[PDB]
């Protein structure tokens, strides 16, 4: 029953969320401890 793209489109859409969070915490991990050493060092 479902025959337009659209459908797909909004599927594939909702498939993944949409979110920042992953970039946020990549670059918190390679931040803060990166600043913590320096800090140390």
């Known amino acids: 029953t ?4 659209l459908f ?3 599927d594939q859409l909702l498939a993944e969320p ?10 918190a991990l390679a931040e803060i401890r ?3 050493a320096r800090e140390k060092r």
């Open 2 to 5: 479902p025959r337009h793209p």
């Open 34 to 36: 990166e600043t913590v």
């Open 8 to 10: 797909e489109a909004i």
């Open 18 to 27: 949409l979110s920042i969070r992953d970039l946020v915490i990549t670059r």
